[PDB]
N, CA, C and O atoms as CSV, one atom per row, in Angstrom:
chain,resi,resn,atom,element,x,y,z
A,1,UNK,N,N,-55.123,41.730,-49.515
A,1,UNK,CA,C,-54.998,43.153,-50.656
A,1,UNK,C,C,-54.161,42.632,-51.283
A,1,UNK,O,O,-53.847,43.298,-52.269
A,2,UNK,N,N,-53.352,41.237,-51.109
A,2,UNK,CA,C,-52.259,40.887,-51.850
A,2,UNK,C,C,-52.530,40.924,-53.920
A,2,UNK,O,O,-53.638,40.690,-54.404
A,3,UNK,N,N,-51.531,41.189,-54.622
A,3,UNK,CA,C,-51.563,41.315,-56.209
A,3,UNK,C,C,-51.115,40.839,-56.481
A,3,UNK,O,O,-50.639,40.044,-55.671
A,4,UNK,N,N,-50.706,40.716,-57.912
A,4,UNK,CA,C,-49.890,40.126,-58.891
A,4,UNK,C,C,-48.470,40.741,-58.434
A,4,UNK,O,O,-48.444,41.871,-57.948
A,5,UNK,N,N,-47.402,40.057,-58.579
A,5,UNK,CA,C,-46.183,40.832,-58.213
A,5,UNK,C,C,-45.291,40.840,-56.912
A,5,UNK,O,O,-44.095,40.565,-56.816
A,6,UNK,N,N,-46.071,41.178,-56.063
A,6,UNK,CA,C,-46.263,41.027,-54.597
A,6,UNK,C,C,-45.397,39.871,-54.306
A,6,UNK,O,O,-45.313,38.879,-55.029
A,7,UNK,N,N,-44.641,40.092,-53.003
A,7,UNK,CA,C,-43.756,38.729,-52.308
A,7,UNK,C,C,-44.347,38.541,-51.230
A,7,UNK,O,O,-44.859,39.481,-50.621
A,8,UNK,N,N,-44.385,37.332,-50.807
A,8,UNK,CA,C,-44.833,37.076,-49.365
A,8,UNK,C,C,-43.981,35.895,-48.868
A,8,UNK,O,O,-43.173,35.399,-49.653
A,9,UNK,N,N,-44.087,35.470,-47.772
A,9,UNK,CA,C,-43.027,34.105,-46.876
A,9,UNK,C,C,-44.054,33.136,-47.021
A,9,UNK,O,O,-45.228,33.433,-46.799
A,10,UNK,N,N,-43.682,31.927,-47.398
A,10,UNK,CA,C,-44.509,30.965,-46.942
A,10,UNK,C,C,-42.984,29.898,-46.618
A,10,UNK,O,O,-41.798,30.192,-46.763
A,11,UNK,N,N,-43.488,28.882,-46.241
A,11,UNK,CA,C,-42.587,27.735,-45.698
A,11,UNK,C,C,-42.550,26.552,-46.889
A,11,UNK,O,O,-43.497,25.965,-47.412
A,12,UNK,N,N,-41.009,26.410,-47.141
A,12,UNK,CA,C,-40.639,25.226,-48.403
A,12,UNK,C,C,-39.600,24.352,-47.530
A,12,UNK,O,O,-38.523,24.823,-47.166
A,13,UNK,N,N,-39.969,23.184,-47.260
A,13,UNK,CA,C,-38.591,22.291,-46.631
A,13,UNK,C,C,-38.377,22.908,-45.482
A,13,UNK,O,O,-37.186,23.187,-45.345
A,14,UNK,N,N,-39.332,23.370,-44.231
A,14,UNK,CA,C,-38.713,23.740,-43.164
A,14,UNK,C,C,-38.055,24.967,-43.369
A,14,UNK,O,O,-37.284,25.295,-42.468
A,15,UNK,N,N,-38.170,25.751,-44.362
A,15,UNK,CA,C,-37.431,27.078,-44.396
A,15,UNK,C,C,-38.240,28.363,-44.828
A,15,UNK,O,O,-38.737,28.328,-45.954
A,16,UNK,N,N,-38.410,29.390,-44.130
A,16,UNK,CA,C,-39.060,30.327,-44.522
A,16,UNK,C,C,-38.457,31.375,-45.723
A,16,UNK,O,O,-37.496,32.144,-45.742
A,17,UNK,N,N,-39.311,31.082,-46.531
A,17,UNK,CA,C,-38.630,31.600,-48.109
A,17,UNK,C,C,-39.932,32.647,-49.083
A,17,UNK,O,O,-41.161,32.612,-49.034
A,18,UNK,N,N,-39.347,33.179,-49.594
A,18,UNK,CA,C,-39.956,34.725,-50.319
A,18,UNK,C,C,-40.349,33.702,-51.596
A,18,UNK,O,O,-39.613,32.935,-52.217
A,19,UNK,N,N,-41.977,34.016,-51.775
A,19,UNK,CA,C,-42.499,33.693,-53.469
A,19,UNK,C,C,-43.290,34.594,-54.085
A,19,UNK,O,O,-44.038,35.250,-53.360
A,20,UNK,N,N,-43.309,34.807,-55.378
A,20,UNK,CA,C,-44.001,35.978,-55.824
A,20,UNK,C,C,-45.089,35.578,-56.520
A,20,UNK,O,O,-45.141,34.597,-57.262
A,21,UNK,N,N,-46.122,36.485,-56.231
A,21,UNK,CA,C,-47.556,35.970,-56.422
A,21,UNK,C,C,-47.664,36.550,-57.972
A,21,UNK,O,O,-47.632,37.690,-58.434
A,22,UNK,N,N,-47.833,34.991,-58.665
A,22,UNK,CA,C,-47.903,35.266,-60.384
A,22,UNK,C,C,-49.185,35.234,-60.621
A,22,UNK,O,O,-49.423,35.409,-61.816
A,23,UNK,N,N,-50.476,35.021,-59.711
A,23,UNK,CA,C,-51.710,34.794,-60.170
A,23,UNK,C,C,-52.619,34.694,-59.025
A,23,UNK,O,O,-52.231,34.105,-58.016
A,24,UNK,N,N,-53.934,35.275,-59.087
A,24,UNK,CA,C,-54.865,35.622,-58.242
A,24,UNK,C,C,-56.171,34.749,-58.459
A,24,UNK,O,O,-57.008,35.193,-59.245
A,25,UNK,N,N,-56.402,33.573,-57.838
A,25,UNK,CA,C,-57.491,32.722,-58.102
A,25,UNK,C,C,-58.765,32.978,-57.185
A,25,UNK,O,O,-58.865,33.922,-56.401
A,26,UNK,N,N,-59.570,32.151,-57.366
A,26,UNK,CA,C,-60.294,32.026,-55.687
A,26,UNK,C,C,-61.413,30.579,-55.694
A,26,UNK,O,O,-62.053,30.087,-56.623
A,27,UNK,N,N,-61.326,30.252,-54.488
A,27,UNK,CA,C,-61.987,28.978,-54.551
A,27,UNK,C,C,-63.310,29.130,-53.922
A,27,UNK,O,O,-63.468,29.595,-52.793
A,28,UNK,N,N,-64.084,28.793,-54.555
A,28,UNK,CA,C,-65.439,28.666,-53.957
A,28,UNK,C,C,-66.123,28.373,-52.877
A,28,UNK,O,O,-66.983,29.025,-52.285
A,29,UNK,N,N,-65.550,27.058,-52.611
A,29,UNK,CA,C,-65.730,26.223,-51.323
A,29,UNK,C,C,-65.546,27.033,-49.979
A,29,UNK,O,O,-66.453,27.258,-49.179
A,30,UNK,N,N,-63.911,27.533,-49.825
A,30,UNK,CA,C,-63.547,28.301,-48.834
A,30,UNK,C,C,-63.995,29.906,-49.068
A,30,UNK,O,O,-64.007,30.688,-48.118
A,31,UNK,N,N,-64.270,30.213,-50.095
A,31,UNK,CA,C,-65.260,31.170,-50.212
A,31,UNK,C,C,-63.989,32.607,-49.982
A,31,UNK,O,O,-64.188,33.673,-49.400
A,32,UNK,N,N,-62.660,32.107,-50.701
A,32,UNK,CA,C,-61.634,33.083,-49.986
A,32,UNK,C,C,-60.765,32.998,-51.322
A,32,UNK,O,O,-60.829,32.065,-52.122
A,33,UNK,N,N,-60.003,34.039,-51.429
A,33,UNK,CA,C,-58.932,34.262,-52.651
A,33,UNK,C,C,-57.687,33.314,-52.530
A,33,UNK,O,O,-57.139,33.189,-51.435
A,34,UNK,N,N,-57.255,32.675,-53.585
A,34,UNK,CA,C,-56.146,31.851,-53.571
A,34,UNK,C,C,-55.002,32.283,-54.474
A,34,UNK,O,O,-55.319,32.853,-55.518
A,35,UNK,N,N,-54.128,32.151,-54.295
A,35,UNK,CA,C,-52.714,32.801,-54.725
A,35,UNK,C,C,-52.085,31.955,-55.554
A,35,UNK,O,O,-51.971,30.822,-55.086
A,36,UNK,N,N,-51.615,32.124,-56.679
A,36,UNK,CA,C,-50.100,30.966,-57.420
A,36,UNK,C,C,-49.152,31.688,-57.260
A,36,UNK,O,O,-48.863,32.680,-57.929
A,37,UNK,N,N,-48.495,31.165,-56.198
A,37,UNK,CA,C,-46.922,31.773,-56.150
A,37,UNK,C,C,-46.103,31.092,-56.691
A,37,UNK,O,O,-46.302,29.960,-57.133
A,38,UNK,N,N,-45.031,31.735,-56.719
A,38,UNK,CA,C,-43.448,31.043,-57.533
A,38,UNK,C,C,-42.322,31.283,-56.842
A,38,UNK,O,O,-42.165,32.412,-56.378
A,39,UNK,N,N,-41.188,30.137,-56.612
A,39,UNK,CA,C,-40.278,30.078,-55.834
A,39,UNK,C,C,-39.298,30.816,-56.461
A,39,UNK,O,O,-39.566,31.266,-57.575
A,40,UNK,N,N,-38.066,31.063,-55.906
A,40,UNK,CA,C,-36.894,31.215,-56.796
A,40,UNK,C,C,-36.149,30.581,-57.629
A,40,UNK,O,O,-35.254,30.977,-58.376
A,41,UNK,N,N,-36.792,29.099,-57.356
A,41,UNK,CA,C,-36.018,28.178,-58.149
A,41,UNK,C,C,-37.535,27.572,-59.518
A,41,UNK,O,O,-37.348,26.680,-60.347
A,42,UNK,N,N,-38.773,28.298,-59.374
A,42,UNK,CA,C,-39.197,27.956,-60.359
A,42,UNK,C,C,-40.344,27.295,-59.939
A,42,UNK,O,O,-41.399,27.331,-60.572
A,43,UNK,N,N,-40.146,26.563,-58.672
A,43,UNK,CA,C,-41.155,25.425,-58.171
A,43,UNK,C,C,-42.727,26.531,-57.933
A,43,UNK,O,O,-42.668,27.545,-57.237
A,44,UNK,N,N,-43.588,26.235,-58.404
A,44,UNK,CA,C,-44.943,26.469,-57.754
A,44,UNK,C,C,-46.071,26.234,-56.927
A,44,UNK,O,O,-46.231,25.047,-56.641
A,45,UNK,N,N,-46.963,27.099,-56.425
A,45,UNK,CA,C,-47.804,26.298,-55.262
A,45,UNK,C,C,-48.708,27.495,-55.117
A,45,UNK,O,O,-48.492,28.705,-55.164
A,46,UNK,N,N,-49.953,26.662,-54.898
A,46,UNK,CA,C,-51.057,27.748,-54.643
A,46,UNK,C,C,-51.347,27.859,-53.072
A,46,UNK,O,O,-51.045,26.885,-52.382
A,47,UNK,N,N,-51.731,28.620,-52.660
A,47,UNK,CA,C,-51.959,29.164,-51.233
A,47,UNK,C,C,-53.295,30.372,-50.786
A,47,UNK,O,O,-53.641,31.477,-51.203
A,48,UNK,N,N,-53.588,29.768,-50.104
A,48,UNK,CA,C,-54.754,30.471,-49.321
A,48,UNK,C,C,-54.282,31.974,-48.818
A,48,UNK,O,O,-53.311,32.097,-48.071
A,49,UNK,N,N,-55.071,33.143,-49.301
A,49,UNK,CA,C,-54.486,34.384,-49.124
A,49,UNK,C,C,-54.706,34.847,-47.617
A,49,UNK,O,O,-55.819,34.758,-47.099
A,50,UNK,N,N,-53.959,35.184,-47.156
A,50,UNK,CA,C,-53.947,35.529,-45.392
A,50,UNK,C,C,-54.871,36.723,-45.226
A,50,UNK,O,O,-55.069,37.200,-44.108
């Protein structure tokens, strides 16, 4: 149920940190939503939506 602008916790360099959801995509292979998240410093990452 994660949507654009929401905030989630992920690991970055062994530390639990907050990232902001900037985009919702879909992985046809895993048949599951994927979110483009952006960290405080501007780094981005793709994460499978829990």
